[PDB]
């Protein structure tokens, strides 16, 4: 009875953790896209601008 | 008469000791199961938690 109770706690706590990890995989994929974009947006502005001589 | 009296004391005291030992064998078997379980329960929580940087 104690074992069956513990196994459920392990089974469903692991599932919650695996969900978070799973979020991290998807989050990394979209975060990567914007990480590229941000540098580009500044590039054009740095080239266009009158910054420095 | 003294021998027969002593032999009973030896026979039945040994039986009580062997019972305790026998308990220890069974107790070790179930204690081993929970010893594994306890570390696992903490593992998931340690990974999930915001403990440390």
Swiss-Prot record, chains A, B:
Task: Kindly indicate where the leader peptide sits in this chain.
Answer: none
Give the transmembrane region(s): none
Judging by the UniProt lineage, the source's domain of life is Bacteria
| Annotated compartments | Cell inner membrane
State what the entry records as the consequence of deleting this gene: Essential, it cannot be completely disrupted. Cells with very low levels of protein have no ordered thylakoids, are barely green and are non-photosynthetic.
The record's function comment reads: Required for thylakoid formation.
By sequence similarity, the record places it as follows: Belongs to the PspA/Vipp/IM30 family.
- Protein's name according to its UniProt entry: Membrane-associated protein Vipp1
What gene does the UniProt entry assign to this protein?
vipp1
Q: Which residues of the full protein are shown?
A: 109 to 161 of 267
């Amino acid at each position: 009875a104690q074992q069956r109770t513990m196994s459920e706690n392990l089974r469903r706590n692991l599932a919650a953790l695996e969900a978070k990890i799973s979020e991290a995989k998807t989050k990394k994929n979209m975060l990567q896209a914007r990480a590229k974009a941000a540098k580009a947006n500044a590039e054009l502005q740095q080239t266009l601008g009158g910054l420095g001589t």
